[PDB]
Amino acid sequence: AIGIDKINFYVPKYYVDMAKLAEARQVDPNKFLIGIGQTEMAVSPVNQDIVSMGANAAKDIITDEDKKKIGMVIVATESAVDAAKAAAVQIHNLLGIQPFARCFEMKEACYAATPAIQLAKDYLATRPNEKVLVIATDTARYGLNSGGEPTQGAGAVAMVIAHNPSILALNEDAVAYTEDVYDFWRPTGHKYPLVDGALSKDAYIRSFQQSWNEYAKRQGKSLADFASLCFHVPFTKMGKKALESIIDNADETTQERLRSGYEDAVDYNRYVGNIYTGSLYLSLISLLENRDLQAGETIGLFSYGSGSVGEFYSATLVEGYKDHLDQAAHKALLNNRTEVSVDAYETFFKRFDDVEFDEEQDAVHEDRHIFYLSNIENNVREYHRPELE
Amino acid sequence: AIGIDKINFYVPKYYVDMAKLAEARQVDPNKFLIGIGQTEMAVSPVNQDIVSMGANAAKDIITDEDKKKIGMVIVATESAVDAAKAAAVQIHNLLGIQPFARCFEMKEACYAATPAIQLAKDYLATRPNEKVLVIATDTARYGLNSGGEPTQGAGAVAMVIAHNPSILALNEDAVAYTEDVYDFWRPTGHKYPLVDGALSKDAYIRSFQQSWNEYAKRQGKSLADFASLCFHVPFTKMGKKALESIIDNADETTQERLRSGYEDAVDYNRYVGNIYTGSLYLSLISLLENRDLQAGETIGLFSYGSGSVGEFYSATLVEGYKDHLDQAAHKALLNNRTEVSVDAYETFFKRFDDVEFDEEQDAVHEDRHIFYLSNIENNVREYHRPELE
Ligand SMILES: CC(C)(COP(=O)([O-])OP(=O)([O-])OC[C@H]1O[C@@H](n2cnc3c(N)ncnc32)[C@H](O)[C@@H]1OP(=O)([O-])[O-])[C@@H](O)C(=O)NCCC(=O)NCCSC(=O)C[C@@](C)(O)CC(=O)[O-]
Ligand SMILES: CC(C)(COP(=O)([O-])OP(=O)([O-])OC[C@H]1O[C@@H](n2cnc3c(N)ncnc32)[C@H](O)[C@@H]1OP(=O)([O-])[O-])[C@@H](O)C(=O)NCCC(=O)NCCSC(=O)C[C@@](C)(O)CC(=O)[O-]
């Protein structure tokens, strides 16, 4: 079998309390906490770009042996920093991976990480001793006082795909669904995305229903066959509406189980926000660590990308997977962050727009053990490398 | 066997004479004709963007049956018009391909179409009745009076990957090579690429030598084993220098053959210019149609992307491939174009920068049988479809 052998995520060291953001935006805190379903929003310091966040997510799950066996590094993002050079190239360099590897980016809104791991699996079919590194990295920025502001976030998720995966085996049952719609998009030159709020929810749910229906038909399966589902998470309130749209034909036993699985799956996302390509996979991590699913059980996954493309596929838990997760590290990552005021958040936000370096505001001295953007000279980004290196 | 079943290209209806461009830039025409090795430069009218060019390249090689079997549409480009929405989604819509397909973009400078077709092959390994559509589409724009201006071009190449390919079987011997270098890149916000002319030369050749050397070692092969080599073509002279850098250990019979093959491979490119991701594949079309290679013979291909990533792999000619090409149509495509003066070219160029529509200057009435960008309303691009639909 081939699948996810290792998985990890990274989010910036700052966050803004959603209740505080609500107060600053003149709305009832529960509108954000319950209405949208978010609790803490990741805030990006200038010294963390998609390259450094991606490197930080992958660094803790790649051994010296893995560096010799990785044949491809694929970066999924819709927050690129170059129109030509793939961020996968810089990350491959920062991680010290062997040279004879393919490095490139995949793009399609929040969907890109899915074809990356699926095609990584196809690539590995005839290469039992190789591995593939897939990294989802993004900064969901809508703008101060914008409609999408409350759903903002930033982070990266790294996955190592290989034979005899220690965590999840990817099954051969994926089915995608494409439909040309303008629910969310970002033309060249626009700093923030254009969005048709209401339309985005309809497009999202339709893609899910169409993808699921075809999958059920082709595989002769039903929701009762899954221990849990795992979806893309722009915000928990979204995934709940999508969930209820179909469980609406499932028996009571299945409904209770899938609803419970969902809460476990979006637990971590509630404290981060939308991280685009990485949302579904951050939710996968949350599900694997917060729930006690048994080996051999199957998870049903739905990946979405505005524009739009959806895909439903399944994966099976591998015997002993709990021993290959880093729940303590992940809980620590989230708890060790520092809360910043809305005012401070707005200042950070504006500085990020123009990559305005400030080593004191970004408290760079604290980042000795991680990768971070240190400066830009002659249009070339320079990165600080972990001191242990 | 799995490989290229159908292949075609599209370039805009205008071009500027390189001798004329030389006179306007105050340089000897031969500097361009022989020095760089280019004769005519493709010129982009505003009504041709990467989406319409891509659709035009694919439309003549997609049958109603293919539309039902295509499982993925992958667009390779470094000239994206949206930071989130993949151009593959619009092309999938324009071509009327069945809905249950993956659509996304791949990015890594001029390298992206290669992992696209290679992974398309891997995807098809267990899907005997499916096909994959790969489209390389780009606009190489350096700027008026810039160092790279003479190498400019625009166009798209479409390839249908399938089982029992009618033209070329892709062999299982690919090897890529990645090395972080800033020879060419384009930070977000930059209309044109930043380039280190001299460095780009060395980077291109080093990538080729490193990739070829590892390929030769892994396969136990030599240049004598190839009927011809096919490379990425930013400009003919480039590929000649790279070529001479290794043939420099080949016998005389091999040197004569590979040099002759190179001339056949860059024939079409001389009249178009650099089309980034599509250069290597436009050269492949040129080689297949201009040379009389025999079934069973093998071609060695080198793909390059600044940044940088290179890859060397081989493909074998299928019996009867000549009956599946479209040489007459291709000669017509190039011949039916209209020459524009340098002043007109500069006017087109400046208009393209701001997507300034002008139905008379772009002469849209002439484009009744092709796809073209007709307008942009509320940040959404609208396309004219062939009237035969
Ligand atoms: C998400 C919206 C539309 C929200 O927009 P909004 O106006 O800020 O909030 P709302 O008015 O839409 O509703 C908030 C909810 O809170 C409730 N509420 C009201 N007051 C209270 C109160 N006092 N206490 C408790 N609850 C309260 C209210 O009733 C409502 O519940 P609902 O209508 O859902 O049942 C907006 O912020 C937005 O446009 N979001 C960003 C876009 C987005 O996330 N798209 C949807 C998903 S599409 C997707 O996943 C693709 C994407 C986004 O990732 C892009 C890509 O793929 O790249
Ligand atoms: C290509 C350069 C460097 C040329 O720059 P230039 O200054 O315009 O011309 P040159 O000075 O470099 O030399 C022109 C040649 O003409 C000769 N010459 C001189 N006068 C005469 C005359 N009267 N009669 C005949 N010949 C004459 C002269 O001797 C020389 O021959 P060479 O040095 O090669 O032997 C520049 O235009 C440039 O920067 N090009 C764009 C970048 C590029 O194409 N890079 C090379 C490959 S990198 C690649 O393939 C990646 C890329 C570019 O596609 C990016 C991506 O991946 O996305």
mmCIF file of N, CA and C in Angstrom, chain A residues 230-302:
data_model
loop_
_atom_site.group_PDB
_atom_site.id
_atom_site.type_symbol
_atom_site.label_atom_id
_atom_site.label_comp_id
_atom_site.label_asym_id
_atom_site.label_seq_id
_atom_site.Cartn_x
_atom_site.Cartn_y
_atom_site.Cartn_z
ATOM 1 N N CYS A 230 -13.872 13.751 6.534
ATOM 2 C CA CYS A 230 -12.933 14.837 6.796
ATOM 3 C C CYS A 230 -13.059 15.714 5.549
ATOM 4 N N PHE A 231 -13.387 16.990 5.775
ATOM 5 C CA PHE A 231 -13.596 17.991 4.717
ATOM 6 C C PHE A 231 -12.618 19.163 4.755
ATOM 7 N N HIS A 232 -12.748 20.027 3.750
ATOM 8 C CA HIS A 232 -11.955 21.247 3.649
ATOM 9 C C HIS A 232 -12.580 22.189 4.679
ATOM 10 N N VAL A 233 -11.757 22.938 5.405
ATOM 11 C CA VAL A 233 -12.294 23.824 6.431
ATOM 12 C C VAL A 233 -11.994 25.318 6.299
ATOM 13 N N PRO A 234 -12.886 26.070 5.629
ATOM 14 C CA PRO A 234 -12.707 27.515 5.455
ATOM 15 C C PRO A 234 -13.115 28.175 6.773
ATOM 16 N N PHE A 235 -13.980 27.464 7.490
ATOM 17 C CA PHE A 235 -14.504 27.839 8.800
ATOM 18 C C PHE A 235 -15.500 26.743 9.180
ATOM 19 N N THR A 236 -15.481 26.332 10.445
ATOM 20 C CA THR A 236 -16.347 25.255 10.924
ATOM 21 C C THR A 236 -17.833 25.370 10.587
ATOM 22 N N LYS A 237 -18.366 26.588 10.582
ATOM 23 C CA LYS A 237 -19.779 26.782 10.268
ATOM 24 C C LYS A 237 -20.087 26.280 8.860
ATOM 25 N N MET A 238 -19.104 26.395 7.974
ATOM 26 C CA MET A 238 -19.247 25.957 6.588
ATOM 27 C C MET A 238 -19.358 24.444 6.510
ATOM 28 N N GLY A 239 -18.357 23.768 7.059
ATOM 29 C CA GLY A 239 -18.341 22.321 7.041
ATOM 30 C C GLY A 239 -19.556 21.687 7.687
ATOM 31 N N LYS A 240 -20.179 22.378 8.640
ATOM 32 C CA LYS A 240 -21.344 21.805 9.302
ATOM 33 C C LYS A 240 -22.539 21.787 8.359
ATOM 34 N N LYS A 241 -22.757 22.896 7.655
ATOM 35 C CA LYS A 241 -23.867 22.987 6.714
ATOM 36 C C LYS A 241 -23.685 21.962 5.600
ATOM 37 N N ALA A 242 -22.452 21.812 5.125
ATOM 38 C CA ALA A 242 -22.178 20.852 4.064
ATOM 39 C C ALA A 242 -22.457 19.442 4.575
ATOM 40 N N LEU A 243 -22.009 19.166 5.796
ATOM 41 C CA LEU A 243 -22.210 17.859 6.408
ATOM 42 C C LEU A 243 -23.688 17.483 6.485
ATOM 43 N N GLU A 244 -24.488 18.376 7.058
ATOM 44 C CA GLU A 244 -25.918 18.139 7.214
ATOM 45 C C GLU A 244 -26.679 17.978 5.898
ATOM 46 N N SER A 245 -26.137 18.525 4.815
ATOM 47 C CA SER A 245 -26.800 18.448 3.516
ATOM 48 C C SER A 245 -26.966 17.035 2.952
ATOM 49 N N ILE A 246 -26.227 16.063 3.483
ATOM 50 C CA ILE A 246 -26.333 14.696 2.974
ATOM 51 C C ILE A 246 -26.639 13.627 4.019
ATOM 52 N N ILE A 247 -26.127 13.806 5.231
ATOM 53 C CA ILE A 247 -26.341 12.829 6.292
ATOM 54 C C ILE A 247 -27.812 12.593 6.623
ATOM 55 N N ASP A 248 -28.399 13.927 5.571
ATOM 56 C CA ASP A 248 -29.840 14.085 5.745
ATOM 57 C C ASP A 248 -30.630 12.839 5.344
ATOM 58 N N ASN A 249 -30.161 11.471 4.676
ATOM 59 C CA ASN A 249 -30.539 10.172 4.134
ATOM 60 C C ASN A 249 -29.843 9.048 4.894
ATOM 61 N N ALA A 250 -28.917 9.419 5.772
ATOM 62 C CA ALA A 250 -28.183 8.443 6.567
ATOM 63 C C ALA A 250 -29.000 8.059 7.794
ATOM 64 N N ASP A 251 -28.806 6.835 8.274
ATOM 65 C CA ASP A 251 -29.531 6.365 9.443
ATOM 66 C C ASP A 251 -28.995 7.091 10.674
ATOM 67 N N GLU A 252 -29.750 7.036 11.765
ATOM 68 C CA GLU A 252 -29.368 7.706 13.000
ATOM 69 C C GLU A 252 -28.003 7.324 13.569
ATOM 70 N N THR A 253 -27.650 6.043 13.505
ATOM 71 C CA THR A 253 -26.361 5.594 14.023
ATOM 72 C C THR A 253 -25.217 6.258 13.258
ATOM 73 N N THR A 254 -25.368 6.327 11.941
ATOM 74 C CA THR A 254 -24.362 6.933 11.079
ATOM 75 C C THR A 254 -24.285 8.442 11.301
ATOM 76 N N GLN A 255 -25.442 9.082 11.444
ATOM 77 C CA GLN A 255 -25.469 10.526 11.651
ATOM 78 C C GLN A 255 -24.739 10.917 12.927
ATOM 79 N N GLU A 256 -24.980 10.178 14.008
ATOM 80 C CA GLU A 256 -24.326 10.482 15.276
ATOM 81 C C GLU A 256 -22.815 10.333 15.141
ATOM 82 N N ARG A 257 -22.388 9.240 14.517
ATOM 83 C CA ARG A 257 -20.967 8.983 14.335
ATOM 84 C C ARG A 257 -20.282 10.047 13.479
ATOM 85 N N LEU A 258 -20.857 10.357 12.323
ATOM 86 C CA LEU A 258 -20.239 11.343 11.445
ATOM 87 C C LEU A 258 -20.246 12.756 12.027
ATOM 88 N N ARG A 259 -21.269 13.091 12.805
ATOM 89 C CA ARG A 259 -21.319 14.418 13.410
ATOM 90 C C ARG A 259 -20.208 14.530 14.452
ATOM 91 N N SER A 260 -19.982 13.447 15.191
ATOM 92 C CA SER A 260 -18.945 13.411 16.217
ATOM 93 C C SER A 260 -17.566 13.477 15.559
ATOM 94 N N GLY A 261 -17.412 12.761 14.449
ATOM 95 C CA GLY A 261 -16.143 12.766 13.744
ATOM 96 C C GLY A 261 -15.797 14.158 13.253
ATOM 97 N N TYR A 262 -16.813 14.893 12.808
ATOM 98 C CA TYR A 262 -16.610 16.246 12.311
ATOM 99 C C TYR A 262 -16.071 17.165 13.403
ATOM 100 N N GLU A 263 -16.683 17.126 14.585
ATOM 101 C CA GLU A 263 -16.211 17.978 15.673
ATOM 102 C C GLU A 263 -14.741 17.695 15.967
ATOM 103 N N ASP A 264 -14.344 16.425 15.921
ATOM 104 C CA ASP A 264 -12.944 16.079 16.165
ATOM 105 C C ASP A 264 -12.059 16.597 15.040
ATOM 106 N N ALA A 265 -12.584 16.570 13.821
ATOM 107 C CA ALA A 265 -11.828 17.014 12.653
ATOM 108 C C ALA A 265 -11.585 18.520 12.565
ATOM 109 N N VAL A 266 -12.501 19.328 13.091
ATOM 110 C CA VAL A 266 -12.326 20.777 13.004
ATOM 111 C C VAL A 266 -11.826 21.418 14.289
ATOM 112 N N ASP A 267 -11.519 20.593 15.279
ATOM 113 C CA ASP A 267 -11.030 21.090 16.557
ATOM 114 C C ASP A 267 -9.847 22.041 16.386
ATOM 115 N N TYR A 268 -8.784 21.583 15.728
ATOM 116 C CA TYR A 268 -7.618 22.439 15.545
ATOM 117 C C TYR A 268 -7.904 23.659 14.669
ATOM 118 N N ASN A 269 -8.716 23.490 13.630
ATOM 119 C CA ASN A 269 -9.012 24.598 12.725
ATOM 120 C C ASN A 269 -9.656 25.789 13.429
ATOM 121 N N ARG A 270 -10.398 25.511 14.499
ATOM 122 C CA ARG A 270 -11.064 26.557 15.274
ATOM 123 C C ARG A 270 -10.084 27.566 15.862
ATOM 124 N N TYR A 271 -8.838 27.143 16.046
ATOM 125 C CA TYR A 271 -7.811 27.993 16.649
ATOM 126 C C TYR A 271 -6.799 28.527 15.651
ATOM 127 N N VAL A 272 -7.064 28.310 14.368
ATOM 128 C CA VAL A 272 -6.153 28.755 13.321
ATOM 129 C C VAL A 272 -6.820 29.607 12.251
ATOM 130 N N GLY A 273 -7.914 29.096 11.701
ATOM 131 C CA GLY A 273 -8.609 29.801 10.647
ATOM 132 C C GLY A 273 -8.348 29.077 9.340
ATOM 133 N N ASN A 274 -8.822 29.647 8.241
ATOM 134 C CA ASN A 274 -8.653 29.039 6.924
ATOM 135 C C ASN A 274 -7.191 29.142 6.473
ATOM 136 N N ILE A 275 -6.599 28.020 6.071
ATOM 137 C CA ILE A 275 -5.230 28.059 5.559
ATOM 138 C C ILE A 275 -5.218 27.508 4.129
ATOM 139 N N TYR A 276 -6.336 27.733 3.447
ATOM 140 C CA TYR A 276 -6.557 27.327 2.061
ATOM 141 C C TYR A 276 -6.202 25.866 1.727
ATOM 142 N N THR A 277 -5.159 25.647 0.929
ATOM 143 C CA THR A 277 -4.773 24.283 0.534
ATOM 144 C C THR A 277 -4.524 23.345 1.707
ATOM 145 N N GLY A 278 -4.129 23.904 2.844
ATOM 146 C CA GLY A 278 -3.865 23.066 4.000
ATOM 147 C C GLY A 278 -5.027 22.798 4.941
ATOM 148 N N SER A 279 -6.156 23.471 4.741
ATOM 149 C CA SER A 279 -7.296 23.297 5.641
ATOM 150 C C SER A 279 -7.780 21.865 5.822
ATOM 151 N N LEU A 280 -8.016 21.155 4.722
ATOM 152 C CA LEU A 280 -8.475 19.770 4.799
ATOM 153 C C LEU A 280 -7.470 18.885 5.521
ATOM 154 N N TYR A 281 -6.192 19.105 5.245
ATOM 155 C CA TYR A 281 -5.169 18.278 5.853
ATOM 156 C C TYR A 281 -4.846 18.623 7.306
ATOM 157 N N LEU A 282 -5.130 19.859 7.715
ATOM 158 C CA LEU A 282 -4.942 20.249 9.109
ATOM 159 C C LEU A 282 -6.092 19.553 9.846
ATOM 160 N N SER A 283 -7.249 19.493 9.193
ATOM 161 C CA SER A 283 -8.410 18.835 9.767
ATOM 162 C C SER A 283 -8.138 17.338 9.879
ATOM 163 N N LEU A 284 -7.404 16.785 8.915
ATOM 164 C CA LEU A 284 -7.079 15.358 8.962
ATOM 165 C C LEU A 284 -6.227 15.107 10.197
ATOM 166 N N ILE A 285 -5.263 15.991 10.444
ATOM 167 C CA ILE A 285 -4.401 15.853 11.618
ATOM 168 C C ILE A 285 -5.241 15.928 12.898
ATOM 169 N N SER A 286 -6.167 16.879 12.931
ATOM 170 C CA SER A 286 -7.041 17.068 14.088
ATOM 171 C C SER A 286 -7.863 15.806 14.350
ATOM 172 N N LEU A 287 -8.401 15.229 13.280
ATOM 173 C CA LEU A 287 -9.205 14.020 13.386
ATOM 174 C C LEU A 287 -8.381 12.851 13.916
ATOM 175 N N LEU A 288 -7.214 12.631 13.319
ATOM 176 C CA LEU A 288 -6.336 11.534 13.719
ATOM 177 C C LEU A 288 -5.885 11.610 15.174
ATOM 178 N N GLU A 289 -5.684 12.824 15.681
ATOM 179 C CA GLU A 289 -5.217 12.989 17.051
ATOM 180 C C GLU A 289 -6.329 13.122 18.091
ATOM 181 N N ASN A 290 -7.408 13.817 17.747
ATOM 182 C CA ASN A 290 -8.504 13.998 18.689
ATOM 183 C C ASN A 290 -9.458 12.808 18.792
ATOM 184 N N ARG A 291 -9.589 12.030 17.722
ATOM 185 C CA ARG A 291 -10.481 10.878 17.757
ATOM 186 C C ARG A 291 -9.675 9.600 17.965
ATOM 187 N N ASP A 292 -10.346 8.533 18.391
ATOM 188 C CA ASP A 292 -9.677 7.259 18.626
ATOM 189 C C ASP A 292 -10.090 6.208 17.601
ATOM 190 N N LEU A 293 -10.066 6.586 16.327
ATOM 191 C CA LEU A 293 -10.430 5.666 15.259
ATOM 192 C C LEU A 293 -9.547 4.418 15.321
ATOM 193 N N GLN A 294 -10.096 3.281 14.908
ATOM 194 C CA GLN A 294 -9.355 2.024 14.945
ATOM 195 C C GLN A 294 -8.706 1.666 13.615
ATOM 196 N N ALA A 295 -7.574 0.974 13.681
ATOM 197 C CA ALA A 295 -6.873 0.553 12.476
ATOM 198 C C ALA A 295 -7.827 -0.253 11.605
ATOM 199 N N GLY A 296 -7.725 -0.074 10.293
ATOM 200 C CA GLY A 296 -8.596 -0.797 9.388
ATOM 201 C C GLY A 296 -9.863 -0.036 9.048
ATOM 202 N N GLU A 297 -10.211 0.956 9.865
ATOM 203 C CA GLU A 297 -11.403 1.750 9.597
ATOM 204 C C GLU A 297 -11.111 2.727 8.465
ATOM 205 N N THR A 298 -12.162 3.152 7.775
ATOM 206 C CA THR A 298 -12.010 4.046 6.637
ATOM 207 C C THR A 298 -12.533 5.456 6.862
ATOM 208 N N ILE A 299 -11.794 6.428 6.340
ATOM 209 C CA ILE A 299 -12.171 7.832 6.433
ATOM 210 C C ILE A 299 -12.561 8.274 5.029
ATOM 211 N N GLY A 300 -13.590 9.110 4.941
ATOM 212 C CA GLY A 300 -14.020 9.616 3.653
ATOM 213 C C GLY A 300 -13.588 11.062 3.621
ATOM 214 N N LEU A 301 -12.836 11.446 2.595
ATOM 215 C CA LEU A 301 -12.355 12.815 2.495
ATOM 216 C C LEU A 301 -12.902 13.597 1.313
ATOM 217 N N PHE A 302 -13.215 14.867 1.550
ATOM 218 C CA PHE A 302 -13.682 15.731 0.474
ATOM 219 C C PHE A 302 -12.823 16.984 0.426
#
